[PDB]
Subunit: 108 residues, 4 copies
Protein backbone atom coordinates (compact mmCIF):
# COMPACT_ATOMS: atom_id res chain seq x y z
CA UNK A 1 0.00 0.00 0.00
CA UNK A 2 1.36 3.29 -1.24
CA UNK A 3 0.38 5.94 1.24
CA UNK A 4 2.25 3.77 3.91
CA UNK A 5 5.41 3.35 1.85
CA UNK A 6 5.36 7.16 1.09
CA UNK A 7 5.20 7.81 4.86
CA UNK A 8 8.18 5.55 5.53
CA UNK A 9 10.13 7.25 2.78
CA UNK A 10 9.42 10.68 4.23
CA UNK A 11 10.25 9.85 7.92
CA UNK A 12 13.65 11.60 7.70
CA UNK A 13 17.21 11.05 8.90
CA UNK A 14 19.41 12.33 11.66
CA UNK A 15 22.64 13.86 10.14
CA UNK A 16 25.66 12.57 11.94
CA UNK A 17 28.81 14.67 11.11
CA UNK A 18 31.57 12.28 9.82
CA UNK A 19 33.88 14.27 12.14
CA UNK A 20 31.81 13.19 15.12
CA UNK A 21 31.69 9.54 13.87
CA UNK A 22 35.48 9.71 13.39
CA UNK A 23 36.39 11.18 16.78
CA UNK A 24 33.81 10.38 19.45
CA UNK A 25 36.08 7.67 20.96
CA UNK A 26 38.79 10.28 21.52
CA UNK A 27 36.29 12.61 23.25
CA UNK A 28 35.87 9.83 25.73
CA UNK A 29 32.46 8.74 24.36
CA UNK A 30 31.32 5.21 23.85
CA UNK A 31 28.97 3.82 21.05
CA UNK A 32 26.16 3.62 23.59
CA UNK A 33 26.53 7.35 24.47
CA UNK A 34 26.88 8.24 20.76
CA UNK A 35 23.46 6.50 20.11
CA UNK A 36 21.94 8.14 23.12
CA UNK A 37 23.05 11.59 21.52
CA UNK A 38 21.29 10.46 18.24
CA UNK A 39 18.05 9.64 20.10
CA UNK A 40 18.22 13.14 21.92
CA UNK A 41 18.68 14.91 18.50
CA UNK A 42 15.77 12.97 17.20
CA UNK A 43 13.52 13.89 20.15
CA UNK A 44 14.55 17.56 19.52
CA UNK A 45 13.48 17.28 15.84
CA UNK A 46 10.04 16.29 16.93
CA UNK A 47 9.67 19.09 19.45
CA UNK A 48 10.60 17.08 22.62
CA UNK A 49 13.48 19.12 23.99
CA UNK A 50 13.75 17.60 27.52
CA UNK A 51 13.03 13.82 27.00
CA UNK A 52 13.31 11.69 30.22
CA UNK A 53 15.89 8.81 30.64
CA UNK A 54 12.94 6.46 30.28
CA UNK A 55 11.75 8.03 26.96
CA UNK A 56 15.35 7.87 25.79
CA UNK A 57 15.82 4.28 27.01
CA UNK A 58 12.68 3.02 25.34
CA UNK A 59 14.36 3.09 22.03
CA UNK A 60 17.56 1.62 23.45
CA UNK A 61 18.83 -1.81 24.65
CA UNK A 62 19.64 -0.07 28.05
CA UNK A 63 17.21 0.21 31.03
CA UNK A 64 15.75 3.55 32.18
CA UNK A 65 18.06 3.60 35.27
CA UNK A 66 21.07 2.86 33.14
CA UNK A 67 20.14 5.60 30.65
CA UNK A 68 19.79 8.14 33.66
CA UNK A 69 23.42 7.27 34.60
CA UNK A 70 24.60 7.80 31.02
CA UNK A 71 22.94 11.23 30.81
CA UNK A 72 24.53 12.08 34.15
CA UNK A 73 27.99 11.03 32.85
CA UNK A 74 27.43 13.17 29.69
CA UNK A 75 26.57 16.24 31.83
CA UNK A 76 29.75 15.58 33.84
CA UNK A 77 31.98 15.15 30.84
CA UNK A 78 30.73 18.44 29.47
CA UNK A 79 29.24 16.81 26.34
CA UNK A 80 25.72 18.09 26.83
CA UNK A 81 24.25 20.99 29.05
CA UNK A 82 20.82 21.56 30.43
CA UNK A 83 19.49 25.08 29.71
CA UNK A 84 14.08 22.58 30.80
CA UNK A 85 16.12 21.77 27.71
CA UNK A 86 19.08 19.69 26.63
CA UNK A 87 21.72 21.22 24.33
CA UNK A 88 24.73 19.53 22.45
CA UNK A 89 26.49 22.86 22.09
CA UNK A 90 29.25 21.67 24.45
CA UNK A 91 29.82 18.49 22.30
CA UNK A 92 30.61 20.55 19.25
CA UNK A 93 32.94 22.84 21.19
CA UNK A 94 34.82 19.75 22.64
CA UNK A 95 34.92 18.38 19.12
CA UNK A 96 36.32 21.58 17.57
CA UNK A 97 38.96 21.85 20.37
CA UNK A 98 40.06 18.33 19.70
CA UNK A 99 40.23 18.90 15.90
CA UNK A 100 42.34 22.12 16.39
CA UNK A 101 44.60 20.05 18.72
CA UNK A 102 45.13 17.21 16.15
CA UNK A 103 45.68 19.72 13.44
CA UNK A 104 48.36 21.62 15.47
CA UNK A 105 49.98 18.30 16.37
CA UNK A 106 49.93 17.04 12.76
CA UNK A 107 51.80 20.12 11.50
CA UNK A 108 48.68 21.91 10.57
Amino acid sequence: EKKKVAEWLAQGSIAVPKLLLGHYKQLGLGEGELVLLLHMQSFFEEGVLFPTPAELAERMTVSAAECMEMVRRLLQKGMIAIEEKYTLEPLWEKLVHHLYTQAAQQGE
Copy 2:
Protein backbone atom coordinates in the same frame (compact mmCIF):
# COMPACT_ATOMS: atom_id res chain seq x y z
CA GLU B 1 37.53 31.46 17.31
CA LYS B 2 36.20 28.15 18.52
CA LYS B 3 32.72 28.72 19.84
CA LYS B 4 31.89 30.14 16.28
CA VAL B 5 33.37 27.20 14.39
CA ALA B 6 31.50 24.79 16.79
CA GLU B 7 28.25 26.61 15.92
CA TRP B 8 28.86 26.26 12.19
CA LEU B 9 29.63 22.59 12.63
CA ALA B 10 26.40 22.02 14.53
CA GLN B 11 24.05 23.95 12.13
CA GLY B 12 22.71 20.71 10.60
CA SER B 13 21.77 19.36 7.18
CA ILE B 14 18.61 18.77 5.23
CA ALA B 15 18.42 15.04 4.16
CA VAL B 16 17.55 14.77 0.53
CA PRO B 17 16.47 11.16 -0.40
CA LYS B 18 18.69 9.95 -3.34
CA LEU B 19 15.39 8.67 -4.82
CA LEU B 20 14.06 12.21 -4.91
CA LEU B 21 17.37 13.56 -6.38
CA GLY B 22 17.20 10.76 -8.98
CA HIS B 23 13.59 11.25 -10.07
CA TYR B 24 12.38 14.81 -9.50
CA LYS B 25 12.73 15.62 -13.25
CA GLN B 26 10.32 12.79 -14.07
CA LEU B 27 7.79 14.10 -11.51
CA GLY B 28 7.75 17.21 -13.61
CA LEU B 29 9.87 19.24 -11.13
CA GLY B 30 12.65 21.57 -12.02
CA GLU B 31 15.93 22.30 -10.02
CA GLY B 32 14.45 25.61 -8.91
CA GLU B 33 11.34 23.87 -7.45
CA LEU B 34 13.53 21.13 -5.91
CA VAL B 35 15.52 23.90 -4.04
CA LEU B 36 12.36 25.66 -3.06
CA LEU B 37 11.23 22.23 -1.44
CA LEU B 38 14.63 22.17 0.44
CA HIS B 39 14.11 25.71 1.77
CA MET B 40 10.46 24.73 2.92
CA GLN B 41 11.85 21.62 4.76
CA SER B 42 14.41 23.81 6.36
CA PHE B 43 11.83 26.39 7.51
CA PHE B 44 9.83 23.43 8.97
CA GLU B 45 12.92 22.25 10.95
CA GLU B 46 13.11 25.59 12.61
CA GLY B 47 9.44 25.72 13.53
CA VAL B 48 8.23 27.93 10.60
CA LEU B 49 5.56 25.74 9.04
CA PHE B 50 3.84 28.31 6.75
CA PRO B 51 6.75 30.51 5.41
CA THR B 52 5.66 33.22 2.88
CA PRO B 53 6.91 33.33 -0.80
CA ALA B 54 9.02 36.28 0.27
CA GLU B 55 10.65 34.39 3.21
CA LEU B 56 11.24 31.52 0.82
CA ALA B 57 12.58 33.79 -1.94
CA GLU B 58 15.01 35.57 0.35
CA ARG B 59 17.28 32.64 0.29
CA MET B 60 16.80 32.14 -3.45
CA THR B 61 17.96 33.81 -6.71
CA VAL B 62 14.18 34.22 -7.58
CA SER B 63 12.01 37.28 -6.65
CA ALA B 64 9.15 37.06 -4.13
CA ALA B 65 6.52 37.25 -6.94
CA GLU B 66 8.28 34.53 -8.87
CA CYS B 67 8.50 32.30 -5.77
CA MET B 68 4.62 32.82 -5.20
CA GLU B 69 4.07 31.46 -8.75
CA MET B 70 6.30 28.46 -8.08
CA VAL B 71 4.43 27.59 -4.87
CA ARG B 72 1.19 27.94 -6.79
CA ARG B 73 2.46 25.56 -9.52
CA LEU B 74 3.54 23.05 -6.80
CA LEU B 75 0.03 23.14 -5.23
CA GLN B 76 -1.41 22.54 -8.71
CA LYS B 77 0.89 19.69 -9.56
CA GLY B 78 -0.06 17.99 -6.33
CA MET B 79 3.53 18.10 -4.98
CA ILE B 80 2.72 19.96 -1.79
CA ALA B 81 -0.66 20.58 0.13
CA ILE B 82 -1.69 23.24 2.54
CA GLU B 83 -3.27 21.82 5.74
CA GLU B 84 -1.88 27.24 8.07
CA LYS B 85 0.74 24.67 7.18
CA TYR B 86 2.58 23.27 4.18
CA THR B 87 3.04 19.49 3.84
CA LEU B 88 5.21 17.43 1.31
CA GLU B 89 3.14 14.32 1.94
CA PRO B 90 1.82 14.47 -1.65
CA LEU B 91 5.43 14.62 -3.06
CA TRP B 92 6.33 11.33 -1.44
CA GLU B 93 3.12 9.68 -2.64
CA LYS B 94 3.80 10.91 -6.27
CA LEU B 95 7.35 9.65 -5.84
CA VAL B 96 6.30 6.19 -4.60
CA HIS B 97 3.71 5.88 -7.44
CA HIS B 98 6.37 6.68 -9.96
CA LEU B 99 8.85 4.18 -8.43
CA TYR B 100 6.17 1.37 -8.43
CA THR B 101 5.50 2.29 -12.11
CA GLN B 102 9.21 2.07 -13.15
CA ALA B 103 9.58 -1.12 -11.23
CA ALA B 104 6.52 -2.75 -12.93
CA GLN B 105 7.80 -1.52 -16.30
CA GLN B 106 11.36 -2.80 -15.67
CA GLY B 107 10.12 -6.34 -14.95
CA GLU B 108 10.02 -5.79 -11.27
Copy 3:
Protein backbone atom coordinates in the same frame (compact mmCIF):
# COMPACT_ATOMS: atom_id res chain seq x y z
CA UNK C 1 41.85 30.15 13.83
CA UNK C 2 42.79 28.84 10.27
CA UNK C 3 40.20 29.32 7.48
CA UNK C 4 41.39 26.59 4.99
CA UNK C 5 41.23 24.14 7.87
CA UNK C 6 37.75 25.05 8.99
CA UNK C 7 36.59 24.69 5.39
CA UNK C 8 38.15 21.19 5.30
CA UNK C 9 36.33 20.35 8.49
CA UNK C 10 33.05 21.68 7.13
CA UNK C 11 33.50 19.78 3.79
CA UNK C 12 33.72 16.39 5.53
CA UNK C 13 30.00 16.02 5.60
CA UNK C 14 27.47 13.89 7.38
CA UNK C 15 26.06 10.37 7.49
CA UNK C 16 22.25 10.47 7.18
CA UNK C 17 20.89 8.06 9.78
CA UNK C 18 17.31 7.07 8.98
CA UNK C 19 14.85 7.69 11.75
CA UNK C 20 13.15 4.42 10.96
CA UNK C 21 16.44 2.59 11.72
CA UNK C 22 17.04 4.62 14.92
CA UNK C 23 13.46 4.04 15.91
CA UNK C 24 13.60 0.24 15.57
CA UNK C 25 17.10 -1.20 15.68
CA UNK C 26 16.46 -2.61 19.26
CA UNK C 27 13.30 -4.24 18.10
CA UNK C 28 15.43 -5.82 15.28
CA UNK C 29 17.79 -7.36 17.85
CA UNK C 30 20.62 -4.82 17.37
CA UNK C 31 22.69 -3.18 20.12
CA UNK C 32 24.01 0.38 20.11
CA UNK C 33 27.46 -0.98 19.26
CA UNK C 34 26.15 -2.75 16.11
CA UNK C 35 24.25 0.36 15.12
CA UNK C 36 27.41 2.52 15.34
CA UNK C 37 29.35 -0.31 13.54
CA UNK C 38 26.81 -0.09 10.64
CA UNK C 39 27.35 3.79 10.61
CA UNK C 40 31.10 3.28 10.41
CA UNK C 41 30.54 0.80 7.48
CA UNK C 42 28.21 3.25 5.73
CA UNK C 43 30.91 5.89 6.11
CA UNK C 44 33.55 3.59 4.49
CA UNK C 45 31.09 2.79 1.59
CA UNK C 46 30.72 6.58 1.05
CA UNK C 47 34.50 6.90 0.81
CA UNK C 48 34.54 4.10 -1.82
CA UNK C 49 35.78 1.34 0.65
CA UNK C 50 33.13 -1.25 -0.11
CA UNK C 51 34.54 -3.96 2.09
CA UNK C 52 36.27 -2.45 5.04
CA UNK C 53 38.24 -4.95 7.25
CA UNK C 54 37.48 -5.34 11.05
CA UNK C 55 40.69 -3.54 11.85
CA UNK C 56 39.63 -0.52 9.74
CA UNK C 57 36.22 -0.65 11.48
CA UNK C 58 37.76 -0.98 14.98
CA UNK C 59 40.12 1.98 14.58
CA UNK C 60 37.30 4.53 15.19
CA UNK C 61 35.39 2.39 17.80
CA UNK C 62 36.03 1.57 21.47
CA UNK C 63 36.21 -2.17 20.66
CA UNK C 64 39.21 -4.30 19.52
CA UNK C 65 39.70 -5.54 15.97
CA UNK C 66 38.84 -8.99 17.26
CA UNK C 67 35.47 -7.87 18.88
CA UNK C 68 34.67 -5.95 15.70
CA UNK C 69 35.24 -9.17 13.59
CA UNK C 70 32.97 -10.98 16.06
CA UNK C 71 30.32 -8.26 15.62
CA UNK C 72 30.54 -8.42 11.72
CA UNK C 73 30.28 -12.21 12.03
CA UNK C 74 27.17 -11.88 14.35
CA UNK C 75 25.55 -9.32 11.93
CA UNK C 76 26.16 -11.82 8.95
CA UNK C 77 24.46 -14.45 11.03
CA UNK C 78 21.51 -12.38 12.20
CA UNK C 79 21.02 -11.59 8.43
CA UNK C 80 21.46 -7.82 8.91
CA UNK C 81 24.29 -7.48 6.39
CA UNK C 82 25.46 -9.89 3.53
CA UNK C 83 28.64 -10.13 1.35
CA UNK C 84 27.91 -9.92 -2.40
CA UNK C 85 33.01 -8.16 -3.44
CA UNK C 86 31.23 -5.86 -0.88
CA UNK C 87 29.01 -5.59 2.29
CA UNK C 88 25.42 -4.68 1.86
CA UNK C 89 22.72 -3.58 4.32
CA UNK C 90 19.82 -4.72 2.14
CA UNK C 91 19.06 -7.65 4.46
CA UNK C 92 18.71 -5.15 7.31
CA UNK C 93 16.23 -3.17 5.24
CA UNK C 94 14.18 -6.23 4.40
CA UNK C 95 13.85 -7.09 8.11
CA UNK C 96 12.99 -3.48 8.88
CA UNK C 97 10.37 -3.37 6.12
CA UNK C 98 8.85 -6.67 7.32
CA UNK C 99 8.72 -5.22 10.85
CA UNK C 100 7.25 -1.89 9.78
CA UNK C 101 4.69 -3.77 7.80
CA UNK C 102 3.63 -5.97 10.73
CA UNK C 103 3.45 -2.95 13.10
CA UNK C 104 1.24 -1.08 10.51
CA UNK C 105 -1.25 -3.98 10.26
CA UNK C 106 -1.45 -4.51 14.05
CA UNK C 107 -2.27 -0.88 14.46
CA UNK C 108 -4.90 -1.20 11.73
CA UNK C 109 -2.90 1.38 9.73
CA UNK C 110 -3.42 -0.45 6.49
Copy 4:
Protein backbone atom coordinates in the same frame (compact mmCIF):
# COMPACT_ATOMS: atom_id res chain seq x y z
CA UNK D 1 2.99 -3.99 -2.75
CA UNK D 2 6.42 -5.85 -2.91
CA UNK D 3 8.51 -5.97 0.31
CA UNK D 4 12.03 -6.65 -1.20
CA UNK D 5 11.44 -3.66 -3.45
CA UNK D 6 10.39 -1.29 -0.72
CA UNK D 7 13.48 -2.32 1.25
CA UNK D 8 15.63 -1.52 -1.82
CA UNK D 9 13.96 1.86 -2.04
CA UNK D 10 14.50 2.52 1.65
CA UNK D 11 18.19 1.41 1.46
CA UNK D 12 19.04 4.02 -1.19
CA UNK D 13 19.64 6.66 1.40
CA UNK D 14 19.95 10.40 1.52
CA UNK D 15 22.29 13.25 0.61
CA UNK D 16 22.88 15.48 3.66
CA UNK D 17 22.62 19.07 2.43
CA UNK D 18 24.26 21.45 4.89
CA UNK D 19 22.04 24.24 6.11
CA UNK D 20 24.93 26.64 5.87
CA UNK D 21 25.17 25.91 2.12
CA UNK D 22 21.37 26.20 1.63
CA UNK D 23 21.39 29.35 3.67
CA UNK D 24 24.09 31.11 1.60
CA UNK D 25 24.55 29.68 -1.88
CA UNK D 26 22.81 32.81 -3.44
CA UNK D 27 25.10 35.07 -1.53
CA UNK D 28 28.01 33.00 -3.00
CA UNK D 29 26.80 33.70 -6.55
CA UNK D 30 25.21 30.26 -7.12
CA UNK D 31 21.85 29.56 -8.77
CA UNK D 32 19.41 26.81 -7.81
CA UNK D 33 20.55 24.85 -10.87
CA UNK D 34 24.21 24.91 -9.73
CA UNK D 35 23.17 23.93 -6.23
CA UNK D 36 21.26 20.86 -7.51
CA UNK D 37 24.23 20.13 -9.90
CA UNK D 38 26.56 20.06 -6.82
CA UNK D 39 24.03 17.63 -5.09
CA UNK D 40 24.09 15.38 -8.13
CA UNK D 41 27.96 15.45 -8.03
CA UNK D 42 27.97 14.69 -4.29
CA UNK D 43 25.68 11.75 -5.03
CA UNK D 44 28.09 10.38 -7.71
CA UNK D 45 31.08 10.81 -5.25
CA UNK D 46 29.09 8.73 -2.70
CA UNK D 47 28.65 5.99 -5.30
CA UNK D 48 32.43 6.01 -5.93
CA UNK D 49 32.21 8.04 -9.26
CA UNK D 50 34.74 10.71 -8.41
CA UNK D 51 34.67 12.45 -11.75
CA UNK D 52 31.27 12.15 -13.28
CA UNK D 53 30.99 13.42 -16.92
CA UNK D 54 28.45 16.21 -17.91
CA UNK D 55 26.33 13.62 -19.64
CA UNK D 56 26.10 11.54 -16.44
CA UNK D 57 25.24 14.76 -14.54
CA UNK D 58 22.64 15.86 -17.13
CA UNK D 59 20.77 12.54 -17.16
CA UNK D 60 18.98 13.34 -13.84
CA UNK D 61 18.59 17.14 -14.50
CA UNK D 62 16.27 19.17 -16.74
CA UNK D 63 19.28 20.61 -18.63
CA UNK D 64 21.18 19.19 -21.67
CA UNK D 65 24.61 17.59 -21.46
CA UNK D 66 25.95 20.68 -23.16
CA UNK D 67 24.38 23.14 -20.57
CA UNK D 68 25.64 20.90 -17.78
CA UNK D 69 29.25 21.09 -19.23
CA UNK D 70 28.80 24.86 -19.38
CA UNK D 71 27.68 24.89 -15.73
CA UNK D 72 30.71 22.69 -14.59
CA UNK D 73 32.94 25.04 -16.58
CA UNK D 74 31.31 28.15 -14.88
CA UNK D 75 31.67 26.50 -11.38
CA UNK D 76 35.47 25.80 -12.16
CA UNK D 77 35.78 29.44 -13.05
CA UNK D 78 33.89 30.88 -10.10
CA UNK D 79 36.29 28.71 -7.96
CA UNK D 80 33.45 26.68 -6.39
CA UNK D 81 34.82 23.29 -7.45
CA UNK D 82 38.41 22.25 -8.64
CA UNK D 83 39.86 19.14 -10.40
CA UNK D 84 42.64 17.44 -8.39
CA UNK D 85 41.73 12.64 -10.91
CA UNK D 86 38.51 13.97 -9.22
CA UNK D 87 36.18 17.00 -8.52
CA UNK D 88 36.32 18.59 -5.16
CA UNK D 89 34.05 21.09 -3.38
CA UNK D 90 36.75 22.37 -1.04
CA UNK D 91 36.97 25.70 -2.90
CA UNK D 92 33.24 26.15 -2.28
CA UNK D 93 33.81 25.56 1.42
CA UNK D 94 36.65 28.05 1.59
CA UNK D 95 34.42 30.76 0.05
CA UNK D 96 31.61 29.81 2.40
CA UNK D 97 33.92 29.93 5.43
CA UNK D 98 35.31 33.32 4.34
CA UNK D 99 31.72 34.57 3.98
CA UNK D 100 30.54 33.16 7.30
CA UNK D 101 33.54 34.72 8.91
CA UNK D 102 32.86 38.18 7.46
CA UNK D 103 29.14 37.98 8.41
CA UNK D 104 30.14 36.99 12.03
CA UNK D 105 32.48 40.01 12.42
CA UNK D 106 29.97 42.50 10.93
CA UNK D 107 27.41 41.32 13.39
CA UNK D 108 29.98 41.69 16.18
CA UNK D 109 29.60 37.93 16.79
CA UNK D 110 33.29 37.46 17.34
